[PDB]
Amino acid sequence: MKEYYITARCTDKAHNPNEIFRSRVFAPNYVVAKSKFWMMLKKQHKVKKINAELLQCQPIFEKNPTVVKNYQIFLRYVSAGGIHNITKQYRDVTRVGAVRQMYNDLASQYRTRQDKIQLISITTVGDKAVKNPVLHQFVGHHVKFPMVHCKPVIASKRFNLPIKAGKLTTKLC
Amino acid sequence: PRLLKKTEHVVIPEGVNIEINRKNIKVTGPRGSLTREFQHPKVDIYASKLVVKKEGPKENVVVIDMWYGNRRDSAVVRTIASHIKNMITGVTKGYQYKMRVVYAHFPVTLVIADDGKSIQVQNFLGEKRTRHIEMYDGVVVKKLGKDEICLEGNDVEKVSQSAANIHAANLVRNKDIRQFLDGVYVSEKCLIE
Amino acid sequence: STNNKVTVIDCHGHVLGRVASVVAKHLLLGQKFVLVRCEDLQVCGTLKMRLVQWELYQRKRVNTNPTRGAFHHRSPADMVRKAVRGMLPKNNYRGKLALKNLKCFEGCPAPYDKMKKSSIPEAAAIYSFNPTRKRTLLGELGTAVGWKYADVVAKNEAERKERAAKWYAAKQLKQKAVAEAKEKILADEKYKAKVAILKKFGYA
Amino acid sequence: KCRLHVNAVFMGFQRAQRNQYPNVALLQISGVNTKEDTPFYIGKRVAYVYKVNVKKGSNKPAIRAIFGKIVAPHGNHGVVKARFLHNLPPKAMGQNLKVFLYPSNI
Amino acid sequence: VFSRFVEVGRVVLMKTGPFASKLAVIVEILDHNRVLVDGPQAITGVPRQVVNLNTISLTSFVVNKVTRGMTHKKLCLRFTQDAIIKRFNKTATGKAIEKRILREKMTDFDKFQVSIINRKINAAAKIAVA
């Protein structure tokens, strides 16, 4: 998942050529990002590739990919019934990181493939504005829990022997 | 949703001694001992000192702790806390279950062994079959008045089941139970002391 | 070379299917296996569910001749051989030879009770199972379906635990004296030259 | 006298689900548990030494060998491909081969 | 009660990756599976990054006065103030890390010496006990 900044203009009779369209598209690459941009223009402004010119498709990188932020995503998806608007919250350090969580979560809980979800907007909210029942328990200052039933960790695949010697034990870590 | 931490506690009175060995709680009180096992693989039982009154001091408690876990598993924390609370009450003020015999026409005679470890229900609805109903270990039957008995013991689970075994043995069959109101019924459950 | 030594697997606290899959692959690789305590293996599902699966398994039977039909072995040492045989090649010399190097026993018999036991980490019930999931020992299921020798095994295992208790206590006494005697050799001054070499490489 | 080799198991031939190509043999070297340890063994010598119960009237040796080389890794589990002068007999599946320390690059 | 907790300030050891067997400090808990370890990059060389809890192990030390989202400058001050480096090397797992480093640079001659020497010492200790 990568975020892109795309701009274009329309040169025809219907649209004046002094209006520049901007957008921020999340896509695995710039080819997919352009496709999401062109369809957004065509379904909302009657602008087609054969009558428009692309200008910029530069990527957007996270400014500080070391600060943990609570992201809020406003999206709309299509189910068997109809089309719904949802708002989910995730804790990650990058904008493209949270969108990766959103796509995996939606395809699991709602069984919705990626080609039914449109991401309207993604923002950042405060600590106390997280209403996710599970995620509300980690936004505090004094979160603490022991990870029990740890499986012993292997440094690398080199020591991954099929049959071991002696008894086996978990870890309280 | 999954709760990050669910916890419960039970206050230990003075005349009660509690020791724990791998989710196995033994409670010793003035009336005796009571050993029970709690084999839930996701519950941690340990005794600590806690302040439970809003403005009270520290006191000895047993802490039942379950970390990250769904609502199906989390419900076992208050179940185990109730069991330990019941055991503490059982060895301090034991339980007694008073049952009353109800008949319409045929009188029912209860024959209790000398040791109190067994009963005998005779002429229930005129039946020639005599019901025995054995009693669990630590539960003793006695006759309070006419058509009334009570079961004494330290374990609520043993006393309650033994009382229900008496009632279950005297069920009317192939008859209108709304008309044939017969049998032995638990009038009330209370503490000895 | 030739593998003549026998790999001994302690089937205590392991999963039936995941032990068989690892054992079946390595039987084809020429190894010799002896799985002791094949009655302590665990399977998913409560006793009621396991009985429903067993009763369905017992249904399959040749109508015209039940003596030709599927033979439903009830001993846990035969519930593992069936599981292993399913994962091995059928109807060729390669499959028969691979199965010829496999044994389960319901306990630890005379020659295999003093052998170095191994374990299969992939098949451990503490890694592959949610702890809340209810399981069933193969020995407990065997009794419910008609395995008569479940209490004979519990007698033999009890006498094996108590005989290993005195051997371990005596061994721990000797090993403590040997460890303390070595500390005197390490601290000795005549062995100073050798000790410095061990300290240099961290052995001491 | 001394052990100068690592025992390797003749798992089988390079095959597909319903095919088999006996030109390339697959070996499992003892101690290699990933494909990142195989680069040491690429090019080393491999021998399939076996015993034949000859008669007293024959000068044919009782011990013979088929030699080969390890040429490439095979999957992410440290399984190798070995090409021999004569393809190994499938009766020798599951047997132990010798992985020598030469031609050495150390 | 459980002894070691996943919290803020807890010192952890990276068991896999490019920084295996290196110390780290937890300064933010994203969720039940992910934590933000910033084991001071100036001291132990572990960059500020998000790791999964299946790749670390809890130690017995907690850095005092470490709050969530600590900066690298302040965190380095508290790491050396508590003397985590010295305390870690005295523990059983700290010694085993050094032994792994000690034994990996053992040539065949060195292995030959220690194998011969240890056999005699272990035999000599066995003789002494009556």
Add this chain to the structure above:
Amino acid sequence: SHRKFEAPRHGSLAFHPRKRVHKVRATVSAFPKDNAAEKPHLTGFLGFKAGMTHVIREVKRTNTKLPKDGVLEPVTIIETPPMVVAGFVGYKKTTTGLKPITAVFAEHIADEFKRRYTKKWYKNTKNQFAVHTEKYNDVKAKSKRERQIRLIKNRCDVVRVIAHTQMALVPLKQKKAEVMEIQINGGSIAEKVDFAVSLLEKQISVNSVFGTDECIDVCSVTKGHGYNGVIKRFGVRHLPRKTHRGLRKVA
């Protein structure tokens, strides 16, 4: 299609296959469950059927309408001369069933017992139990016997006595005995072996094994009939007279 009318099947499937036995003597499949809280005693015997008579017996039950003068009933007479106990064997409970550990025999053995171990006695050298009897009193053999007694007392659960008949007392032309193992049900394995040792070379009469008015179980081989058709073997319905190719078969 469904059968028009319903009827029980002919013949029992609990006695399938119908295979004729090889030995005239029939071995009991089990002995009554052991109780360790009583004195040792034998739980079986062996006799030869003589014939059948009828008796008039006086009814002692109450609340019955049987005639007061007696009821005619059949009886079977089984001649049971005394047995000669010629050894004992201890069985151990393993994970594949009872396993005989050792068998200890007496010093003196009759030729009736020795005849079981040959198939042409008149051509045999008749040297059965020769080395066991000749070297019975040697110091080496006495130590071995003492070990067999102690081995059974330590690692056994079931003790049975190898008792054989005396066929010189019955009108049968057979001379070789009929060996039968009679389990000892009673006290602990210590006092079971003590009782079994006391019975060595002795004779057990049926009055010691069985009581009066005691209900017992009888196991024996039935009367042979040979090749028989479905009508006799199972009891199927004979076919109508009009039938081609025969009447006494299953259609």
Add this chain to the structure above:
RNA sequence: AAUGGCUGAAAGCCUCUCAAGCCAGAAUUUCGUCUAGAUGAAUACUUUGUCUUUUUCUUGUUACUUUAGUACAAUUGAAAAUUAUAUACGUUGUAUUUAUUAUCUCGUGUAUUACUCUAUCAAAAGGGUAGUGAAUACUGAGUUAACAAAAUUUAAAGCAUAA
């Protein structure tokens, strides 16, 4: 099992549990019992005591007869239980195949052993006691190797006697 209940949360109360834990309950299931039965075990006698193949006698089997070849006592392989594991530690990071400093000789006694063997007490024991040898530690000193060779793993022929 259907069903009736006990304790009991979830959900401060209630609840037989689409929760953990229990009880009673069928012409039911499994032991027990009856029939057939695979690999098996014990004892009695005849033997053999490093071993086989091919011939050959017999109704058939074993032991047996002949010509050869092969090995020759001595370091192998065990804690249990739990995993939300009394506390502490996390003891990190290669299971079997696969852990011996070439060879022989010379030197002093002590000590050690899941070592070999003998005698004995026991024993369905990695058992006890006494002796003997082996290997190892204290702990040596010397000989020799250069080219060749350092492998059994079983192949051929007979029927006198005995069971």
Add this chain to the structure above:
RNA sequence: UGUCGGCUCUUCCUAUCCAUUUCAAGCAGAAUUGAAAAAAGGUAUGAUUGUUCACCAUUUAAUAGGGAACGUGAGCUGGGU
């Protein structure tokens, strides 16, 4: 590929007629009716018709419904076709 029915015989299904265990009723008792577990065991004798089917007379705890080349002709019968 021998085409109906009946006779003989075995097995299987449950969408259960009886026996066993339960819940409900406008279940007072008796007789009943609806429903669950359960297919291990039983489920008949005759007048008329070639009949499957049907209708009568009894008996029974009940006299339930079906499949297996519309089970079954080198198994029978040959009444029908």
Add this chain to the structure above:
RNA sequence: AUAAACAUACUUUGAAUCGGCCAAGUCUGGUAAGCAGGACUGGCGAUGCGGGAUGAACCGAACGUCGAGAUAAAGUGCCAAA
């Protein structure tokens, strides 16, 4: 614009064939049919190979005899290579 000289235009003589069948982001009659009948294209027939356990048509891809590699459909707990 792109392609096309072993391109293009053919002439003569003649073989076999006109029982067809399947798929479907297709249609008509029919309650419906592995039913009956049609429009367009691709296939089976005439066709093997790798995969779907097995299969005339599905997916990949069409075949002189071999060696070495990168692949396609599709898969990587064991049968079974990963």
